[PDB]
């Protein structure tokens, strides 16, 4: 993606969405790769594109960091004078970035810099997620299931729990948590130079209480241990938000990962053949444009069984 951007000469007045997508792709690639110097990449195009897109989109801290990195790099003489001139020009610009662009880490509620080692935040040790079409951060968190609980009956039990947790007004935990969130609300914001701490704990739910207790435990231990959930929280959950990834078609029993979306308003679509996440807007637009899954390189579900003997 970034090479298809860079080889094309840039438009002086280009679309803001295209620039944002290119910046996100470059930042994600730089964060994920870092220093492995694998076969295929040159580590110069990414930095140059990130610098140009940041200069066009403020991003003063990232621009300075990538410009220093490129100064440590060697480039063809066509770009050196432009790079030094842009660096000296940006020297006069204010620091502290521009906000409203740094990714928001879930289970932390804190703001982190765009370039943070192997695509993880400083507050916790949790892997980020991105929609491959737009390379935009997704509001998703990872959780595990007890070995005693089996997934097949887990599905039916959580379905029954979601179904029962609506009409019966006797006792339910979901509506209790919703009402507690509506009644009591704590929202604090603190400003710093690079970071921002968001104290948003209005939603008092058993899941979030267990999450914050586990986060304090991990801070005490200074290590990462994935959260393990018991039957009560599992019953307290619903059906639409879960986005479990299965590798059963390749291996009948290898592993299974479970993810929860904090924001239920945003819809996410998970291709199980390639096990990749997408935003329904971009995924639907791409499917309408072409009937092939981009990373999966497989047929679309809406179409018929194209897999016949002739194609085989």
């Amino acid at each position: 993606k970034v090479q298809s951007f860079v080889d094309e000469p840039f438009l002086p007045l280009s679309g803001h969405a295209y620039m944002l997508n290119i910046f996100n792709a470059a930042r994600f690639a730089i964060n994920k790769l870092g220093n492995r110097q694998l076969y295929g990449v040159q580590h110069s195009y990414l930095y140059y594109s990130l610098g140009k897109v940041s200069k066009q989109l403020e991003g003063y801290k990232t621009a300075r960091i990538c410009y220093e990195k490129l100064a440590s790099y060697k480039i063809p003489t066509e770009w050196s004078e432009e790079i030094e001139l842009s660096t000296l020009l940006i020297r006069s610009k204010p620091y502290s970035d521009q906000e409203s662009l740094l990714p928001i880490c879930n289970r932390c509620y804190n703001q982190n810099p765009a370039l943070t080692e192997g695509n993880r935040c400083s507050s916790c040790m949790h892997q980020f997620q991105n929609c491959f079409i737009s390379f935009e951060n997704l509001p998703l968190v990872e959780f595990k299931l007890d070995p005693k609980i089996t997934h097949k009956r887990f599905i039916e039990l959580i379905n029954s729990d979601k179904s029962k947790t609506q009409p019966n007004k006797k006792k339910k935990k979901a509506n209790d948590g919703w009402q507690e969130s509506h009644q009591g609300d704590q929202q604090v914001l603190t400003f710093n130079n690079s970071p921002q701490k968001g104290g948003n704990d209005n939603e008092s739910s058993p899941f979030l209480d267990k999450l914050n207790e586990v986060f304090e435990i991990q801070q005490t231990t200074q290590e990462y241990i994935p959260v393990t959930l018991d039957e009560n929280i599992v019953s307290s959950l619903s059906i639409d938000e879960v986005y479990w990834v299965d590798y059963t078609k390749y291996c009948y029993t290898a592993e299974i990962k479970y993810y929860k979306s904090m924001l239920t308003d945003i819809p996410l679509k998970n291709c199980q053949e390639c096990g990749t996440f997408y935003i329904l807007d971009e995924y639907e637009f791409e499917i309408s444009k072409t009937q092939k899954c981009p990373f999966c390189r497989s047929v679309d579900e809406r179409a018929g069984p194209q897999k016949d003997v002739f194609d085989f």
């Binding site: 679309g15 609506q166 639409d240 819809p267 329904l280 639907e284 309408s288």
Partner: protein, 444 residues
């Protein structure tokens, strides 16, 4: 084709064989020499030199003369530089290598050591197909490049490939070619042939043997032609290569032949070429020609973008009404978001199959019929979100209906007990028993 007749003029029917004879190992073959047709007879044998009789046909006299020809042994070819004490060490090492007596030969070579002697060591080790002594010698060259080649080549199941690589490192291409043919390996030989310079021979070998790396060979030949400044040959081998849509414009702009690029794009008549040329025209402030080439490339998003740059919304509206492109409508609605044209923006978002944005905007602005019409044709998630919003609204009956038409029917059943209706409740009961039977009929 004719590879056995013309070579017999200089080849004779006499071959020389060298042997070391002892009681322990009996007789062992050491080396073989092919005598040319000019060589008439074997004169004698000496340690540093071998002497033969050669005819003198060029003499005009009736009686042709005969001269002595002095030649070096295979292990002594090249070493012109003081041969007084080395012969003993070389003979001892070869003799001990005949029986593979490693340590005796190593301790015999210990006392002298010399880089030229070490390269002769490595050459004869390659000749005798021994690897450990060969890599030890390559360690003793202080030849870091050969060691790096060893390290990068050792990751190969075939030892013959490593031997051929060492032959390349020691500069005899014929032995490496023979080894590659012996091992039935052609890709490494194809790479070597591509490197050395005979590109056409490499192309022929690839097409008759591999045919897989043929595209790579074409690309490499095109790159070589580009280095040779042969623009026509470079572009030709680009179209015979796998990719030519992007390499040709890049080389043309590197050279600066704008008119040649124009001739090429007019001859090709391809949409990506039109898009590239229009983008370049817009970059160099040729707006009208860029618009014309965009029209020839059918990129309506670009016309909407350009007309939005100059705030010429009327022509953009006409274009989106005529072509009815989806992304053009999407970007037009994006502009209308800033332009304060919410109804038309929502309509265009609905047309562009972007459901959630339009339905969420209308839910904030309070439109009822449009959002349910959108959700009826939308996916399950949009249906759920819109009908939950309708639950949040003052009228819940329509939310019940949209659940009934939505993907969640147990929710409709539970609402049926909640609102304690009977007719719609019994219809929902019929629907839920239908879905239960549908699920039970799949597999049991």
């Amino acid at each position: 084709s004719r590879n056995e007749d013309d070579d017999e003029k200089d080849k004779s029917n006499l071959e020389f064989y060298t042997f070391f004879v002892t009681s322990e190992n009996g007789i062992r073959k050491q080396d073989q020499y092919q005598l040319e047709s000019s060589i008439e007879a074997v004169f004698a044998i000496d340690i540093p030199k071998l002497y033969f009789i050669k005819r003198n046909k060029k003499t005009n006299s009736s009686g042709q003369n005969y001269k002595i020809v002095e030649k070096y042994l295979n292990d002594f070819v090249g070493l012109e530089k003081i041969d007084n004490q080395i012969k003993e060490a070389i003979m001892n090492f070869s003799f001990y290598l005949t029986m593979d007596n490693l340590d005796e030969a190593y301790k015999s070579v210990k006392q002298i050591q010399n880089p030229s002697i070490w390269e002769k060591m490595a050459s004869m080790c390659v000749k005798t197909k021994r690897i450990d002594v060969a890599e030890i010698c390559l360690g003793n060259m202080r030849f870091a490049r050969g060691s790096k080649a060893i390290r990068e080549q050792k990751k190969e199941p075939e030892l013959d490939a490593q031997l051929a690589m060492v032959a390349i490192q020691l500069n005899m291409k014929d032995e490496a070619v023979k080894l590659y043919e012996q091992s039935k390996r052609y890709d490494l030989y194809n790479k070597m042939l591509q490197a050395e310079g005979n590109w056409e021979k490499a192309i022929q070998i690839s097409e008759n043997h591999d045919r897989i790396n043929l595209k790579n060979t074409y690309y490499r030949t095109a790159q070589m032609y580009e280095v040779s400044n042969n623009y026509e040959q470079a572009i030709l081998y680009y179209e015979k290569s796998g990719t030519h849509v992007k390499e040709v414009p890049r080389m043309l702009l590197e050279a600066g032949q704008t008119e040649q690029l124009e001739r090429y794009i007019i001859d090709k008549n391809e949409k990506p070429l039109f898009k590239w040329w229009a983008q370049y025209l817009e970059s160099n402030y040729r707006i009208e020609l860029a618009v014309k080439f965009y029209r020839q490339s059918e990129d309506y998003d670009q016309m909407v973008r350009l007309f939005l740059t100059k705030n010429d919304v009327q022509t953009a509206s006409s274009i989106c009404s005529e072509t009815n492109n989806s992304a053009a409508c999407y970007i037009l609605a994006k502009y209308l978001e800033m332009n304060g044209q919410i109804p038309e923006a929502i309509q265009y978002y609905w047309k562009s199959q972007h459901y959630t944005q339009a339905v969420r905007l209308a839910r904030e602005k309070g439109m009822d019929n449009e959002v349910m019409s959108i959700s009826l044709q939308g996916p399950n998630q949009v249906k759920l979100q819109s009908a939950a919003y309708f639950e949040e609204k003052g009228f819940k009956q329509k939310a019940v209906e949209l659940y009934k038409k939505g993907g969640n029917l147990i929710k409709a059943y539970n609402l049926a007990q909640e609102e304690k209706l009977y007719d719609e409740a019994k219809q929902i009961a019929r629907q839920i028993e239908q879905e239960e039977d549908q699920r039970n009929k799949k597999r049991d």
